[PDB]
Design a protein around this ligand. Structure first.
Ligand code: HEM
Ligand code: HEM
Ligand code: HEM
Ligand SMILES: CCCCC[C@H]1C(=O)O[C@@H](C)[C@H](NC(=O)c2cccc(NC=O)c2O)C(=O)O[C@H](C)[C@@H]1OC(=O)CC(C)C
Ligand SMILES: C/C=C(C)/C=C/C=C/[C@H](C)[C@H](C)[C@H](C)[C@H](C)CCc1oc2c(O)c(OC)cc(OC)c2c(=O)c1C
Ligand code: FES
Lengths: 59, 49, 78, 66, 379, 241, 100
């Protein structure tokens, strides 16, 4: 039951808690960025150098 | 120069209007513009200082 | 000033619950939002007036200025 | 080659406001160039036009531009 | 002491100003302003210290340097943006902080208040410099008036200025010697701020009702610490939003044109967080008067404590002075507009007018509506 | 008469707090600067270096900078000498100094367009308008010898002759090089030029906004979570009688 | 023409400090005089006042107020301290004058 499983295992021991903040942050980062980057770029299709980089690298 | 309500000068800082003689006519400015030491050396010559 | 030397307080029973045994969320739509309005409507008639007054003095001021700029079709009918 | 600007200024120069302005101007123009001694200038009137013209010039111009 | 959080000379201070500090239970956001003001002091000192890592105080290099600091230094642009804006978030919070304090008579904690003024003054002072630094058209011409502004003081004036800034005209020296002041000053603000809080702690924090709070008072930590961290992010979002979306939104663009000692820009609009007093200054046609007005325009805060008559502290139960108050806050927002406005009849008068209500509302109205309300209570 | 005309707003491709710059457009914007403005308008704060990865290619910009010779350091015999413009050089100055330029432009000083877009209220909107927008002075109004009427410019008399008409160049990408069109491209450039960070800066802004969104509530709960102890609370006065 | 009586009533409900449910005197800023005044208060009224203040604070701290019922009515407001406070003041003014 997630929340309960979580608390007991992750949030109870101040030792553990922290440990998940870290390993979590690593995950949040990696994911937040890719997501953000995508959201962004997509809202600017064909305007970015990544997008015209090709008229000297095709598309 | 060439702006103001006295056909001389206007200072965009606090609204002091000057006449073509350089005198202060309206605004908060306190004394009239500075008149340097000068003279004319001929028909077309003018030396300041 | 620290704690334990603040005031001679007698006979005040206070009951409060652990945050985990109660809900922080709170009771919006019941007591929540209501009081919010209870206040917008309480001071609106004490705050807004002057701001409103400014506004006018702002608009008036601006329009008039923007007007004193336009020519009097009759500053030269001749 | 034709400049989408000039074409779009053609349409725009026709919008009610432009006309009600372009007219206001035309008069002033020939109202000042008709006299010898007058301080009047048809700048104001000119703007009002422009102001209005270009305004839609903008609402559409960038559509035809790459 | 098994405590430690109280048995350690240093460590105590903390667990005595952030934990264990007795603070009134009932406290509105208007109490965050200050903890924020700090974060500004920081954001300013941190960013600026870092921006100074690239500045080059010297006419011929001064302007460009900054540009370089932006275009060339990684995130150097972000640093700048943040800095110039912290300036504002800084003045905003300060302007609000003063508000709050004014309308809860926190100005009754006198010293904590008087020091406060100093801070303002200094924050105004330090912000004056620094803006000179980038040496833009504004930077220059601001330097020239503000400084020259001490022209008014007779005898010691003309001289004090031709010293204030370098030699006899705002030139390189004045610049280097300003950078120095700027680099230095903030650290003074920091110090005084310490002195400010010291005086405060002597007298607990106020509280919105203006009546003893010993009856309640909660441990600063558990509560207010969070509350600050929150307010941190709240009035952090705007400031950041600006800095990442429309940085120069508040920044006059005219200053993007390197200084020219020969031409002051037609349309010299001082920085927004300065306009009010600015207006006051020009609407009192007389060098001296102009300045004087200004002088007191800000140097009046020192008198508010003496212009307090209400038998009650705050004015939450003083609906009368209460609106008089907003009449003031707005009378200020006005002076401001009238400041960002050229000098013509539509304005000007409006100007000197508000620039009259200002004083009166303070010097006279308040204390009058003050005693009056007491009598409407048999006091 | 302090009478002026305020420039209409154009929906630029990069106006949106979340919309980057059309890098393609800047590329052209660059060319129009290089081929027509970079002969009067200095632009000291940029350099081919930048173009790389933003609208040009390394090799592209390099050969692009070769296109100009620059005066460089002392000999062994110590004497300025010219040499092929490297990648790190800054865009060429057209005049050795201002008063030199002023003597080349009918007594006027073509301002450097590094920060032009943000040095004049209106930015692109202004600039664009200014370019695409000259015309005969209305009546009663007379521009003097050497100047050119342009309503949008204060004084309405500019020292810059309409520097842009149809075809003045030929965007190698196959773009109708119409005035309106080119003039657009110049402005989008002038922007990036004025603040290369643009995109990077907005993207950032994006994330910054998603953190506020996420963080503030979190701490709000936390703030409430913690205060509930008080919000909840209840008093009562029980003396003995 | 217009009763000061009629007026006070106004201001009273206008100040609305009774919405929190505390008497006028429960508000007067605590200056040297008042302190001495309140320090002369009979323990009855003291604890009364206290609670009223703590309740007031507790409310205020919750942003919410007291049911329309519990507000205190103007005529029923008890100037519990005015009397002491006054002696105080004159006591002082008596001393201040004597020290001259
Ligand atoms: C190239 C596309 C180009 C642009 C763009 C352009 C713009 C521009 C601006 C925005 C200004 C004026 C802003 C202001 O209010 O002062 C400006 C000014 C001048 N320019 Fe220009 N200009 C472009 C190209 C050229 C070219 C090729 C020349 C030289 C033939 C030229 C010259 C000038 C001059 C002179 C001015 C002076 C304005 C004045 O002081 O009256 N520009 N330009
Ligand atoms: C007390 C807070 C501070 C205030 C009020 C402040 C304000 C300013 C302002 C407004 C400017 C002009 C910015 C602009 O051009 O828009 C400035 C510039 C600068 N400040 Fe500060 N500053 C402060 C602290 C600092 C600190 C602590 C340092 C370093 C000691 C610093 C170093 C600089 C630098 C490098 C500049 C020049 C570059 C630039 O103009 O951005 N500032 N500061
Ligand atoms: C230098 C920046 C300043 C900082 C960082 C600062 C900090 C503080 C802080 C945090 C408090 C605690 C309570 C609160 O947040 O309101 C405080 C209180 C106060 N400050 Fe400041 N302050 C600053 C400037 C000023 C200024 C310019 C004034 C001057 C009018 C001022 C007046 C006060 C007052 C009156 C109080 C005490 C009453 C109360 O807290 O209710 N402060 N200040
Ligand atoms: C090593 C770190 C020691 C901590 C120093 C730091 C310390 O006083 O931190 C808090 C208490 C201080 N504000 C408050 O206490 C505070 C008081 C009443 C209410 C609220 N909240 C509103 O709801 C508060 O937030 C806040 O204004 O910062 C100051 C001022 C100081 O820091 C400043 O010198 C730093 C400057 C000098 C750089
Ligand atoms: C090194 C520090 C020295 C010499 C001391 C200087 C003192 C600084 C004081 C507190 C500061 C200016 C205050 C905000 C004063 C009261 C407000 C007045 C003020 O007036 C201005 C003004 O009249 C201007 O006219 C064209 C232009 C300006 O900027 C371009 C300003 C301006 O920026 C400020 C702000
Ligand atoms: S600087 Fe001239 S009006 Fe003040």
């Amino acid at each position: 039951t997630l929340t309960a499983r979580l608390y007991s295992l992750l949030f109870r021991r101040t030792s553990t808690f922290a440990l998940t903040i870290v390993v979590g942050a690593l995950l949040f980062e990696r994911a937040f960025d890719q997501g953000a980057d995508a959201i962004y770029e997509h809202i600017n299709e064909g305007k970015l150098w990544k997008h015209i980089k090709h008229k000297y690298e095709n598309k | 120069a060439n702006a103001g309500d006295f056909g001389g000068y206007y200072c965009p800082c606090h609204g002091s209007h000057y006449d073509a003689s350089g005198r202060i006519r309206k605004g908060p400015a306190p004394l009239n513009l500075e008149v340097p030491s000068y003279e004319f050396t001929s028909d077309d010559m003018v030396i300041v200082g | 000033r620290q704690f334990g030397h603040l005031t001679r307080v007698r006979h005040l029973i206070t009951y409060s619950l652990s945050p985990f045994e109660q809900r922080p969320f709170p009771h919006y739509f019941s007591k929540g939002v209501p009081n919010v309005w209870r206040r917008l409507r309480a001071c609106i008639l004490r705050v807004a007036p002057p701001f409103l007054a400014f506004y006018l003095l702002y608009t008036w001021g601006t329009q008039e200025f923007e007007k004193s700029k336009r020519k009097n079709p009759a500053a030269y009918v001749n | 080659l034709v400049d989408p600007l000039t074409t779009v200024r053609e349409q725009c120069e026709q919008l009610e406001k432009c006309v009600k302005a372009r007219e206001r101007l035309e008069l002033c123009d020939e109202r000042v160039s008709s006299r010898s001694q007058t301080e009047e200038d048809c700048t104001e009137e000119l703007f009002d036009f422009l102001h209005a013209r270009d305004h839609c010039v903008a609402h559409k111009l960038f559509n035809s531009l790459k | 002491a098994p405590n430690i959080r109280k048995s350690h000379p240093l460590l105590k201070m903390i667990n005595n100003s952030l934990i264990d500090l007795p603070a009134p239970s009932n406290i509105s956001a208007w109490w965050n302003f200050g903890s924020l003001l700090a974060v500004c002091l920081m954001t300013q000192i941190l960013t600026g210290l870092l921006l100074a890592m690239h500045y080059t105080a010297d006419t011929s290099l001064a302007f460009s340097s900054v540009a370089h600091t932006c275009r060339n230094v990684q995130y150097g642009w972000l640093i700048r943006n943040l800095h110039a804006n912290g300036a504002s978030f800084f003045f905003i919070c300060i302007f609000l902080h003063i508000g709050r304090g004014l309308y809860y008579g926190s100005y009754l904690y006198k010293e904590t208040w008087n020091t406060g003024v100093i801070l303002l003054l200094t924050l105004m002072a330090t912000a004056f410099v620094g803006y000179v630094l980038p040496w833009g058209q504004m930077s220059f011409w601001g330097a020239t008036v503000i400084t020259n502004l001490f022209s008014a003081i007779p005898y010691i004036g003309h001289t004090l200025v031709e010293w204030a800034w370098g030699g006899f005209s705002v030139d390189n020296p004045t610049l280097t010697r300003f950078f120095a002041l700027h680099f230095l000053l903030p650290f003074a603000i920091a110090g005084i701020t310490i002195i400010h809080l010291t005086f405060l702690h002597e007298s607990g924090s106020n509280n919105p009702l203006g009546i003893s709070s010993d009856s309640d008072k909660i441990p600063f930590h558990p509560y207010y610490s969070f509350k600050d961290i929150l307010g941190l992010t709240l009035m952090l979002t705007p400031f950041l939003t600006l800095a990442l979306f429309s940085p120069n939104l508040l920044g006059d663009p005219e200053n993007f044109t390197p200084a020219n000692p020969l031409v002051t820009p037609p349309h010299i609009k001082p920085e927004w967080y300065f306009l009010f007093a600015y207006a006051i200054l020009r609407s009192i046609p007389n060098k001296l008067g102009g300045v004087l007005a200004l002088a007191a325009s800000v140097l009046i805060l020192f008198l508010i404590p003496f212009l307090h008559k209400s038998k009650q502290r705050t004015m939450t139960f003083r609906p009368l002075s209460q609106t008089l108050f907003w009449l003031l806050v707005a009378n200020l927002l006005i002076l401001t507009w009238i400041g960002s406005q050229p000098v013509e009849h539509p304005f000007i008068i409006i100007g000197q007018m508000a620039s009259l209500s200002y004083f009166t509302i303070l010097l006279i109205l308040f204390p009058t509506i003050g005693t009056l309300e007491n009598k409407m209570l048999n006091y | 008469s302090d009478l002026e005309l305020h420039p209409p707003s154009y929906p630029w491709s990069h106006r949106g707090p979340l919309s980057s710059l059309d890098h393609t457009s800047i590329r052209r914007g660059f060319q129009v600067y290089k081929q027509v403005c970079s002969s009067c308008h200095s632009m000291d704060y940029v350099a081919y270096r930048h173009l790389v990865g933003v609208c040009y290619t390394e090799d592209e910009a390099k050969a692009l900078a070769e296109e100009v010779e620059v005066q460089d350091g002392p000999n062994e015999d110590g004497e300025m000498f010219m040499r092929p413009g490297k990648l790190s050089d800054y865009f060429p100055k057209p005049y050795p100094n201002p008063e030199a330029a002023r003597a080349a432009n009918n007594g006027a000083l073509p301002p450097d367009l590094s920060y032009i877009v943000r040095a004049r209220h209106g930015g692109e909107d202004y600039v664009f308008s200014l370019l695409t927008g000259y015309c005969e002075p209305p009546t009663g109004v007379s521009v003097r010898e050497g100047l050119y009427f342009n309503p949008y410019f204060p004084g309405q008399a500019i020292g810059m002759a309409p520097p842009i008409y149809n075809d003045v160049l030929e965007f190698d990408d196959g773009t109708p090089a119409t005035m309106s069109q080119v003039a657009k491209d110049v402005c989008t450039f002038l922007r990036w030029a004025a603040e290369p960070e643009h995109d990077h800066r907005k993207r950032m802004g994006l994330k910054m906004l998603l953190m506020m969104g996420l963080l503030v509530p979190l701490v709000y709960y936390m703030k409430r979570h913690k205060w509930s102890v008080l919000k909840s609370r209840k008093l009562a006065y029980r003396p003995p009688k | 023409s217009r009763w000061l009586e009629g007026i006070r009533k106004w201001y009273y409900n206008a100040a609305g400090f009774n919405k929190y449910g505390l008497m006028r005197d429960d508000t007067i800023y605590e200056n040297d005089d008042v302190k001495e005044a309140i320090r002369r208060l009979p323990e009855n009224l003291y604890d009364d006042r206290m609670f009223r203040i703590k309740r007031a604070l507790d409310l205020n701290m919750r942003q919410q107020i007291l049911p329309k019922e519990q507000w205190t009515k103007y005529e029923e407001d008890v100037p519990y301290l005015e009397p002491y406070l006054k002696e105080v003041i004159r006591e002082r003014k008596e001393r201040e004058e004597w020290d001259k």
